[PDB]
Structure formats: C-alpha cells, structure tokens
Design an enzyme around this catalytic site. Structure first.
Site, PDB file in Angstrom:
ATOM      1  N   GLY A   1       0.807  -1.202   0.000  1.00  0.00           N
ATOM      2  CA  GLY A   1       0.000   0.000   0.000  1.00  0.00           C
ATOM      3  C   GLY A   1       0.841   1.253   0.000  1.00  0.00           C
ATOM      4  O   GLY A   1       1.829   1.363   0.732  1.00  0.00           O
TER       5      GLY A   1
ATOM      6  N   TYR B   1     -26.151 -30.526 -13.174  1.00  0.00           N
ATOM      7  CA  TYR B   1     -27.128 -29.923 -14.077  1.00  0.00           C
ATOM      8  C   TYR B   1     -27.050 -30.538 -15.467  1.00  0.00           C
ATOM      9  O   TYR B   1     -28.060 -30.604 -16.177  1.00  0.00           O
ATOM     10  CB  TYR B   1     -26.903 -28.405 -14.146  1.00  0.00           C
ATOM     11  CG  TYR B   1     -27.968 -27.622 -14.883  1.00  0.00           C
ATOM     12  CD1 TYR B   1     -29.020 -27.023 -14.194  1.00  0.00           C
ATOM     13  CD2 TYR B   1     -27.923 -27.472 -16.271  1.00  0.00           C
ATOM     14  CE1 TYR B   1     -30.003 -26.304 -14.862  1.00  0.00           C
ATOM     15  CE2 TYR B   1     -28.906 -26.758 -16.948  1.00  0.00           C
ATOM     16  CZ  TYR B   1     -29.940 -26.177 -16.236  1.00  0.00           C
ATOM     17  OH  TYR B   1     -30.908 -25.463 -16.894  1.00  0.00           O
TER      18      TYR B   1
ATOM     19  N   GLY C   1       1.845  -5.520   1.614  1.00  0.00           N
ATOM     20  CA  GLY C   1       0.658  -5.959   0.905  1.00  0.00           C
ATOM     21  C   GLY C   1       0.973  -6.601  -0.428  1.00  0.00           C
ATOM     22  O   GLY C   1       0.201  -7.434  -0.912  1.00  0.00           O
TER      23      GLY C   1
ATOM     24  N   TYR D   1      -6.870   3.331   3.443  1.00  0.00           N
ATOM     25  CA  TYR D   1      -6.305   4.131   2.359  1.00  0.00           C
ATOM     26  C   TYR D   1      -7.367   5.074   1.806  1.00  0.00           C
ATOM     27  O   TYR D   1      -8.501   4.660   1.541  1.00  0.00           O
ATOM     28  CB  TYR D   1      -5.758   3.230   1.250  1.00  0.00           C
TER      29      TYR D   1
ATOM     30  N   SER E   1       0.596  -2.226  10.802  1.00  0.00           N
ATOM     31  CA  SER E   1      -0.404  -2.889   9.985  1.00  0.00           C
ATOM     32  C   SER E   1      -0.299  -4.391  10.188  1.00  0.00           C
ATOM     33  O   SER E   1       0.585  -4.898  10.892  1.00  0.00           O
ATOM     34  CB  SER E   1      -0.242  -2.539   8.498  1.00  0.00           C
ATOM     35  OG  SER E   1      -1.388  -2.941   7.753  1.00  0.00           O
TER      36      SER E   1
ATOM     37  N   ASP F   1       4.695  -5.318   7.421  1.00  0.00           N
ATOM     38  CA  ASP F   1       3.473  -4.953   8.152  1.00  0.00           C
ATOM     39  C   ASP F   1       3.779  -4.510   9.579  1.00  0.00           C
ATOM     40  O   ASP F   1       3.291  -3.471  10.034  1.00  0.00           O
ATOM     41  CB  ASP F   1       2.476  -6.116   8.180  1.00  0.00           C
ATOM     42  CG  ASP F   1       1.653  -6.227   6.914  1.00  0.00           C
ATOM     43  OD1 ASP F   1       1.638  -5.296   6.074  1.00  0.00           O
ATOM     44  OD2 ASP F   1       1.006  -7.277   6.764  1.00  0.00           O
TER      45      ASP F   1
END
Lengths: 266, 266, 278, 278, 266, 278
Positions: free
Chosen positions: F79, F251, F125, F89, F154, F149
């Site tokens: 990020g 199906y 991230g 954010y 974070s 992090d």
C-alpha cells in the site's frame, strides 16, 4: 400393509426390504434390545448389504418389541455390559458415509450406545408414548466422545448436549423434538408406517441430489474425510461428461486431449 | 438446608463449598452485580481455587440479591462502565478448560459481559420470574467476538445469536430455554436448591467420564487447544496402564521395553 | 555483553531480564534439563511474570549447560521419568499432574513472542515445548531433536504432534513420532521446525538479537499477527484471543468513548452519520 | 533375507507377512501396476485382513516389478483407464464404482502404520495412494511422482490434493495437480511428501527396517499418535476415531470396573473421594 | 408511513431506501417471484449499491405481492426452471460479507433457491399467515451444498436441515421459528413495518460493533475467508491509533519508529 | 515473442491477453509498484474482466519495470503509505477503504489459475498478494520477499499470514512477519512459498509457458482441483464454491433434464431404477 421381504436371517436382529426401503431392527426385546458383540457384527453385515444394494435408498434402524417380560418397548439400550470384533464405531461410520438416508425409528428406550446410534442417523422418528432418550455413559465410566456427544451438539446445541451426558436424565419424544434431535413425534401405533412413508417420500427424489445433500451436510463437520466423500461423488459427476470421455480417450489413444475452446466459464 | 462453608472472603463476590459443589456468586446487588477489575480478579482467584481442589466437581456461578434499592435481582450486568489486570477472557478460559462442570445460575439480569459469562458455562439454569437475558455490547461499541457470540451460535443457532447481539432486546428464561441457551427454567424460590440438586446428580457420575465428555464437546469447537486438552486427559489414561509401567521402567533401567505380543488390536 | 538482571530465584530454572527480553532457562543440566513437577511449576511462574511485565515483549526459552557430569548439552529432555507414576507426574504435594499443558497454553496465548533457544538435546516433552514456541533457534553443533514419547507409552497428542504437522507437514511429523530418531539442527531447519541454525558459541547472543529485532516492531502488529497465526489452528479459543485484542482496539476509538458516555449518562448514543463504511 | 510367508493369493496383488509386518504390493507390472476394479477389491481385502490381524503393526504398500515388457518400474499408475466409463470404473459385476476411496479410508483409520514404498512411477490415483499413507519411502534412482488427474478430466479432491497440501504446502500441491509434471524422489523429499530417499536395491529392506523400528514402540502410543495427527484434519470422523481409542483406555481402569459392576448389580457406583483432579 | 425513496429502477425487482434502510424486493409476483438470470443480475447490482452506500446499515430482502392471478404471496420461489452471467452464489457471498445486516422478510413462498437466500441472510422475519418454507432442490436434481444446507444446519441443527432437504415438505412461519431459522413470526399486515422497526433498532447501535459482531459470527463457520474479513476490520481499527500514525510517519520520513515504552501489555 | 494484445488501458497497471492467458501487471515502477486506491480499483476491474472472459484460463500477476529512477525491480511494494490515513487508504472519493481484500477474494474464488510473477521486491501488501495467488514464479537475481506490516502498525491477518503458514509452515510464517527480514527467491523456494526460481531474463516467458501447460488440461479438473485445495482452508465459503461447481456438473446429467422437465410439466419425475449406487 407393508409387504416386507426378509433379506437375511440373523440371531440378534431382523433385516427386511420393501420397495427401496431396508429395515434393520434390534430383536432382543427381552433385554430391551441391548447389543452384544454378535449383535454389532450382524448390524454391520446388514448395513453393509444395504450399502451395496442399489435398489435400497433408505434404511430404517428400529427395534422390535414389546418385551415379553413387562410389555415395555425399546429401540436399543446400548452395550450389553455383561460382555478383531466389529465394533459400534465401524457401524456408525457405515451409517455416516453410505449414500443412503438412514432413519432411526425409536419405539422405546434409546439408551447409552443406543442413544448414540440414534444421533448419528440422518433423521429420527420417535414414539410419542414410549420413546425415552437417556445417556448412561457417565454412569459406567464410558463415553462416546464423537458422534454421540460432539455431533449431538450439532443438532441440540452445546448446552443441551452437555446436560444429556452430565446428568443422564430421561427425555420424552416431545422433549427430544423440542431440543432438535427428533424430527417428528409419531403416535406409537403409526410409528413404523410413518417411517416407511417418510422413506418413500425420499425415494421419490433425485438420487444424485440426496447423495450430494447428505454428503454436503456431513462435510461441514467431517473435515478431510467429509471432503473425501463429497469430492468423490463430484468426481463421479465429472466422469459422466463428454469432457471426461475425451480425457480418457486421448490417454488411451496416446494423443493430446482437445477440450475445446472458451471453456473457462464462470 | 444446604450446609455451605465459606471458602474465602472477598470484597465483590462470595465463595462457598458444600459436598463437592463450589458456589461463586457476584455480590454487588446494589449495582446489579456489574463487575469491575477487582471483581474479575476475585472471580479468577475463586475459579482457580475450585480448579485446583480435587474435592470439587461442579462450580455454580450465581448472583446474590436482591438489590436493597429496588428489590430487583441480577446475575451479572457485565462490565462496570465506570472503570496486567486479570480480565474476563482469562476467566472464560478457566471455566472452559477446567475438568469440572460449571453451571450458570441466573436469578436476574444477565447483561453484556454477564450474558457472555452465562454462555461459556457448561449449563445454565434460570429464574422463571426474574431472569432477563440481554446483550448490550453493540450499545457501547464493544463486542465479545468469541465465546459470547460465535459460541452462542453453537447453542441457539446463527439466526438467534445474530438477533441477540444486533438488536440488544430482553429475553425471559422461557424464551432463552426455547432458543437453546437455558437448560431449565426454575421457579425463582427453587433456583439455588435446584442448581445444587443438578450438581449432586453430576457428582454421582464417573469423574473420568465427566472430564472426557466435557472435553469432547469442547473439542469440536476449540480446534488445536481443544485437541491439546482432550488428548492430555487421554495421556493420563494411558499412564495408568501396565504398558506405561513397562515403558517407564525400561527407560529407567536402560533396556528395551517389551510391550508383549499380538498387541496391534483393532 | 548482555546486561542481564536476575528477575527471580528458582530451584530448577533461571529467570533474567534485559531491555525488553526475558530469558527462562532449564537449569538441571546434570540430568539433561528434564522437568520434574517443581520445574513445571517454576516455568509457569516465570512465564506468567513475563506475561504480566509490560516491558517484556520477547521471552527466550533456553537451557543452561553443559552437564558437569559428562559435558553434554541439553535444551530439555522432557518429563523426569523418576517422578512419573499413575495418572501423571507426582509432585511433592502428592498430586499426579500433567501441567506442562498449562505452560504450553501460557506460551501460546501470551501477547509476547516466545523463542525456543535449543543448545542441545530437545527430547520428548522438551521437543514438544520447542514446537509450541513461536520461533526456534538451534545450535548447529549440538542441538539434537528426538521424540521418545512412543518409547515410554506417552504421547503429546496436541501441540507436540498435530501442531508439529503445521510446521513440518504430516509425513514428517508422523516420522518423528513413529520412529523416534535423532535430527540435527540442519535437518530440523530443512523440514521447517527450526528457524535458523546458529553456531553454538553465538546461539544465545543471536537469540537476543532476534528478540531486539521484534522489539523494534509495532507491539499491536506483533500481538495481532501472533494471534492471527494462532487463530487458523486454535478454533474458538483462537477466535476468543484474537477477537479480544480487536475489542481492545475498538475501546480506544472516539466511537467507544461516545458509547460508554451515553450509557453512563442514560441517553441514546449518537454514533454519527454515513458510518456504514466498506 | 526376510522370511516372508504368503498370507493370501490374489490375481492383481501380492500379500505376505513376516514378524509383525504385512506387505501388500501391486503385481501387474506389465501395465505399470494400474488398478482395475478387481485390484481395488483385492487391496481392500488384504488391508482389512492386516487391520484385523493383531500381530501386524505395520503395513508396507509397494509395487512389484520391473515390467517384463519394457523394464520400467512402477509403484502404481492409478486407475486402469480401459475400465473407466460413466460414473466410474466398471467392474466385472457391471457396477461403476470409485471404491479406491474406501481403501483410502481403511489406510487412514486403521490402528497400524501404513508405509508407501515407491520403487517407480507413482501416477494419478497411485500418487494419491502414496499421499494418504502415513509414511513414504522412495527409490532414489527410479521413483517418479506425477499427477495426471487434470489430463483425463479426473480429480482426487480429498486425500490426494487437499491432504497433499498438509505435507508439501498449498503452493506445491497446486503445482503438482495444475501442471502434472514429474518429480524425482529427491524433489519429493525436499517438498515434504517423501520421508526418505533410498537406493533402489535397498528400498524394500529399508522399508522393513523402518517397520521394525515402529514395532519396537508402545502400540498404544503409536495408535494414539496416528489418530492425533489424523484428528487435526479429519474433523468429526477424526474425533470419533481418537475418542474411541480413549474410551478403550478408560475401559481398563478400576473406575470402569466399578461403573460396570455397579450397573450389573443394580446399585449406585462408588467412584471414590477427591477424584476431581487437575 | 415509511417514506421510501426509489434508488434505482429495475425490471424484475424493486430497490428503495429510507433512513438507513435499503429494501430489495422480488417483483415478479405473477410467477411467485422466481428468479431468472436477469433477476439475479439485478439483485447483485442492488446489493452492491447498498454495500457501497455508507448511509445504509440494514438491507431488507423481501417480495412484492400479492399475485394478480390467485392472490397468493411469495418471497421467492427460486430458480426459474424455464431458464459470465452473475449467479446466485455471488449474491449469497455479497450478503454474507457486506458490513451491513441483511434481513430476509418472507411474506409467502420461500422455495428452493429462494429458501437458500433466506437462510444466508443474517436474520429472517416471516408472515404468520402466509410464509411457507420449502426445499425443492432434490425434486429437480439440484442442490445448494453450501449456505443453503450446511449453513442451514448451523441454525436448525443437523437433523432438521436433513429433513428439509430430503423430504421437501412445507413449513409454516411458526414451524420455522420453532426450529430456529426464523427470528420472529409477524402478522402479515405488520410484517414490512416490523422489518423496518427491527432495522431501525440495529441502526441505533455502534456500527463498529455491528460489523465486528457480524464478522465474528461468520468467522466460526467461514474458515480462512471469515478470518480474512474479520481481521480486515481489525486492521481498520489499528489504523486509527496513534501507534499507526507513528508507524506510517516513520516510514515516510525514513526513520526508525518510536512506539514508546512498556507497550507489551496484557 | 508472445503476441500480447492490450485488453484495456489503465493508469496504474497494464492488462493484456494472448492465447488463453491474461497478464495484469503493476505499472508504477518509479515508486516500486506500490498500490494506491486507484491501483486497487484497476486491479479489481482487470481481474473481474479476466474472471468473466471464458477464453482466459490463467492470469499472470506481475510487475513492470525496472524503475527509471534507480533501476530497481519491483513486483509490488504494498500500500502506498502517502495515501494511508484513518481507517485505511484514502481514495479520490474520500473513502477510507481496505479493498485489496476484495481483490484477494477475486483471486481466490475465480475458476482460473492465478500465478504471481515476481521480478523484484514483493513487500508488505505486495507480499500478501503473492501469497494468495495459486502459484508463484520468482526472479532468481532480483526477487526479494519482505514483510513490513509490523514496521508500520499494519497486519494482514488473513491470507497474508495465516494462509502463508499453509505453504511455509507456522514457524517460518511467524519469522517472516515478526522480524521483517529479506528473503531471496531461492530461500522462498526452499521454504515452500515460491514454486520455481527462474533467471530474470526468462521469468515472463517461463510464466507464459507454465500458463500454457495448465491451459492444456481439463478445465473441469482445474476448477475442481483449485476449489478442492481452497476448501480445506476456506470453511463454509470454500464449501459454497466447491459445491457450486458440483451443482453445475449435476445440471448436465440426463437425471437433471428429467427433474427439470417433470417440474415444468407438473408431473412426478421418474429417475429410474436401482439408482442408489455406491
């Protein structure tokens, strides 16, 4: 009347079939249908036959009666405390994994291991007047720590499952219905007929749906085993496709399969 | 009358014992038995004593009353919003893991953290006339996201657990019984006596069965921690065997163990 | 040199602290650092002190040594079999207890990182203690990992085995218990249960340096990450612990100040407009 | 030399026993030890016999060979595609069955350690059989692991794939199935699904020696440890199996003798005083 | 009267908003509110709008009626068996994961996929006189093997979930309340008003509590996905702290963060 | 040369397709391919297009580069902290969002294989995005994996950490987050989170070749296998996704044609005799 046909003769149980329904019943009412090792072996044998018989889609597990001693009724009083031998856990797993619906039909005492057998069945129908649910495991230093207790909590909740085992009290059909472990309270005189009627409603459904739905509802609690069983039935559905015909044929013809274009659908 | 003996003196709670039963009760009825940090520390202390006392097999968690202000009754109104300090989650885990049955005895308001304490107890008995179950967490920007909510769904189902927390309404003993989180609705005048009677029924059972059954029913929801606790009790059973005597003795005598022949049973 | 200060005196272990690190070490090297009931009580006491000390973010669990008898190094050789009896290990008070499990849970749930520092044999219950720690550093020369449970009719059927499979996989966890063979530090690193193989003379210093790297991180991040990685295996207990730390974060918000204030003032809270964000 | 005695004669497999070890081996090497429905029935029959034989603590699952046709070695190449049809593999009785899954469960639940002994190709359903075994030993020179399920519109979505991720991790399990490449014994060891890479000429002897090391352990420990490591993945079924073995241990206690005796004698049991231990 | 404002015009559904409540309703009562692919696409569109609208905290999912043909009422009769296309599983996941409470408002038939939509909603309110719950999946070789069945067992227990799917019988609002999948039985004339009243009680709570509690109760069943969603909301709470301001600022200023002293609290 | 055709134009990413493969790549190399809210919206848009395109069976997630500023290579550095604020954010519309989680779920649930192609730094991230992809290929010379992090208060407490433990084990996952050290491509391969270490100049071509190997497989097998390996960790959501694909297979059967036809014709279905197979 239901036109039952005897499927096999046994010493401690009865085993009959009619129009897609198998009925396995404890047949020692003089001792309230307790099981001894011979009984468990016969239960396994009859359930395995029902498992392998493609005409059978629903198994009723019941008890014969009444007792010739006092006129009382029993489903199953559990382990004959008097007594590889096939044990009741292998029977529980056969009930659990077979692609047929297993209905406990409870006309009387369902006690101890007999209680835990009712719990692992897919559905339970119980005698209004005579069913009595009671857990005696804690009286004799035993415990069903699997389908009898932890799985009982998946139908009556964790408070009531703990009460059943910790106090070992008796519960009526109506009390058991209100807590969630009996599907329907049925007048005693109608119990066996109503069980067969329930079975015939199931037998009119799509067998693929019934299998997949039983295994989906098992899957949430049965972990990797439940995944193995549910995925195995899905593998069966994939095998029926034209895509699978091409996969097999290309392998046998030693060529690259052509699965077509724009197949990555969502 | 029940011949209670005071076990320890506390400021915010009472703690007494009688014939295998320990009773821990909130004792701030003037403020509807809310807990402050001192209360939680005392709760932990009393529960830990009960945990370590081999004479105690059942703990009753109750509330004293009535309020001298308005005559009202309370089990526990939760966190004293006025207020390492021992917190209520460590108390929840002590209730959860101890090899004793813990019964919530609810004579009145069971609110917020007091509600979540009732939920984590193994059983709940509630005053017909005066128990009121209410979840205020969402009113004050709090939440019990563990035993108070997710575990509540394991006894009342996911729809009702969500309703309890999202709307924060009041529920009677009878309503709580019908949803599955109260084991028995008891007339107020009989509540404490009936709780002791329930405790004595448990205390007449096999202590090994009771421990193993509590831990089996915990295991299905408590993951690796539940496995650690259940397996630990199984290790205890193995230690008692002649096989274990030989395992230890061979180690101490620096020799190969002889566990016998044809031991790979099924 | 690390300026350790003894925190408390014990019979069977040592307990010291320095600059945010606590070190708890087995101190019965003449019997390869086995634990008797007294040892387990002292372990619990020291770990709980570390748990309650807000200056401590990392706990090192190690072994003193070597043996003065035969020069061998041990982390912990498991339960002292001379104290083992019916129903468990027999303490001085006569109780038969298996309360290394309570120590295991204290390690597991505490909002601090616990590093097993293995200078020698890690056997049986000592092996299982290494497994439940968050990290393991091992002596290259002298760490040896060995599971003897199946030799003595014991078993750690929780964090010692099922959780071991969550770091080495199910085939290797089964091998460790069913055959009870020895594994070096390097083998243990290759299978995934040892984080770093360290020269023996550098092991304790390197464990302290690892601890200081963690202590430079956000404590909220470290707590939430430990509890998130516990949660995937610890079921409802893991959910209780992780959600409880989340509740602590909610308590700090202005939204929670309003919730509590409205409650104390007997008025309806006003949590604002357009709050249903995504 | 191992003094094997044939236990039963079969068309598609061999079944022998010696000193606590049973060996079940695929014996259609001319078609790389694929299983047809008859093979699967015979596998079930032999494994169930081993399950019921209390002298047998370890079952080796291996492959005979090499092919007399082309000299190639196989563990098991999976389902014989010449028998595959609608809804599964078509047996001589006309049924379309997928009952290798019943064999998988027998391996999984039996209170005996099952070792896959892989002398050659382990492909498709043969790969998944190796995965579900408790341990795998592999021929250094000739073991090759390969998943062909995605080539033929099949899938083992249970023990073959999801459980594979519990020994090699989720990235590698996905790679094995999505690309269907070959892996050597050493690669399989490095990823975590093979316990030991063994010279081909020593593979069968080494599997027997591994079995004898297990057979020297406490059988209660081995059972409880297998079932504990199953339990973490097998959900309620794993709980049923593990708790069932615990019930067996409770039955042996003097406490249970009193419980049963009081019941038979219509009296209240006396389980003693101060029994609520911790 | 409730002052609904139309949010968007659709062919097969209606979508309106009022004071924090969004209402999405099936609007094909002439065919008992069955969904065709167009309907599912519109459902997804309206639910996604509600998901993104920060003024909306509660979504009501209902059915319009009555049928102009016979005066009957329907919630949703499931898949229009006549018929990437957005499918109902993506709608189920949107209901499940959105940080808003979704209430099924059932005025009539809730059948098949319509039944499974009611199940996955957080709460269900049902018409006393006209709600009928019925599972037809097994009649047509279909099955909802996820939220429709396995999750149904998390609110009615495993016995009753199996009965619902295996027999495909009809159940009244009161029967569905007694089994645990309906939160409240409401007189038909009051159903829509009562649903809005329930919504307003939720909207008066802490939005952080409501989000965290929904996601905690999802977490126990939703595995790693539930963990991702619950942890993601916790990350949001951490971001608001002064500790997070320092973490970000130190990164941007290329310096070591100073998170303070004695921060390792318990 | 791969004949890529641009599928859509974006500000922060590139999106191209060729012969069944889609490639989505971060295209802000001057800031090491960090994602701002606009980037995350564009990622979602491209992944959803790939999800809906039935010609696309494999999605490559990569990074463009190198930086023109300093020559460094990045997959994704997480990020963009310049956009980080209260509650997440901050986008151009003022919302504080964490919707990389919605991208994570799109990757996880889509019936296509997503391969992380890592040519450089994979941080924070960006690391967690690599973890949730089905496969990861990494540049030998320049891929570096790092979790920051805990440096910035974070945490990815879901697929970034708990799921990481499902490929590298619990000890290594804890190490990655608690210390935030760098790992090379080879280290990442050895721990189990990288499928193949590739020379940098060959990385993109090799990712395309991997994709073409998957595209030659049965699409039903690939879907069912991805969802089976998701199912063991994804609980009820994983069950919903896997069962939903099974419903699609049902199906297609003649049995389902009869079920639907009987319903539309108001008659009792006839599903045949002896259908209760096993």
């Amino acid at each position: 009347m239901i036109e039952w046909k005897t499927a096999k003769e046994y010493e401690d149980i009865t085993y009959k079939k009619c129009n897609g329904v198998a009925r396995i019943a404890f047949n020692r009412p003089e001792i309230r249908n307790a099981f001894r090792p011979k009984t468990t072996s016969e239960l396994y044998d009859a359930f395995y036959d029902a498992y392998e018989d493609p005409s059978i889609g629903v198994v009723l597990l019941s008890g014969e009666g009444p007792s010739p001693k006092d006129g009382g009724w029993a489903f199953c009083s559990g382990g004959d405390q008097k007594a590889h031998r096939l044990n009741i856990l292998e029977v529980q797993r056969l009930i659990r994994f077979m692609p047929k619906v297993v209905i406990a039909v409870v006309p009387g005492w369902a006690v101890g291991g007999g209680h835990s057998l009712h719990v692992v069945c897919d559905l339970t129908l119980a005698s209004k007047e005579h069913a009595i649910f009671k857990q005696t495991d804690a009286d004799v230093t035993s415990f069903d720590g699997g389908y009898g207790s932890a799985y009982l909590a998946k139908m009556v909740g964790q408070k009531k499952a703990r009460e059943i085992f910790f106090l070992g009290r008796n519960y009526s059909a109506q009390e058991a219905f209100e807590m969630g472990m009996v599907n329907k309270v049925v007048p005693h005189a109608e119990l066996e007929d109503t069980a067969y009627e329930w079975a015939q409603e199931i037998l009119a459904k799509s067998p693929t749906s019934i299998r997949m739905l039983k295994f989906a509802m098992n899957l949430t609690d049965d972990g990797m085993v439940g995944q193995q069983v549910f995925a195995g039935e899905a593998t069966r559905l994939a095998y029926m496709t034209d895509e699978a015909k091409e996969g097999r044929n290309a392998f046998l013809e030693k060529r690259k399969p052509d699965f077509g274009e724009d197949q990555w659908i969502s």
